[PDB]
Design a protein. Sequence first.
Lengths: 8, 8
Amino acid sequence: XAXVXAXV
Amino acid sequence: XAXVXAXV
DNA sequence: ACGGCGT
DNA sequence: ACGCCGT
Ligand SMILES: *C(=O)c1cnc2ccccc2n1
Ligand SMILES: *C(=O)c1cnc2ccccc2n1
Ligand SMILES: *C(=O)c1cnc2ccccc2n1
Ligand SMILES: *C(=O)c1cnc2ccccc2n1
Ligand SMILES: [Mn+2]
Ligand SMILES: [Mn+2]
Ligand SMILES: [Mn+2]
């Protein structure tokens, strides 16, 4: 759920 | 029902 | 009845 | 360096 690199 | 990773 | 990620 | 859900 977090998007820091992927944003799933 | 929500699809945030599975979407059932 | 449902599980996932890359810069 | 990052954590989330509803029909
Ligand atoms: C989002 O909050 C989140 C939490 N855990 C994960 C584990 C594996 C892949 C993606 C994820 N996303
Ligand atoms: C994004 O691509 C990414 C990759 N590795 C991580 C490790 C820890 C926190 C956030 C990250 N984000
Ligand atoms: C969707 O709204 C939803 C709600 N509760 C669940 C529980 C278990 C599996 C899937 C679900 N989906
Ligand atoms: C998606 O794969 C997924 C997995 N675990 C979760 C836990 C809490 C909220 C959303 C989630 N999504
Ligand atoms: Mn699960
Ligand atoms: Mn990775
Ligand atoms: Mn719920």
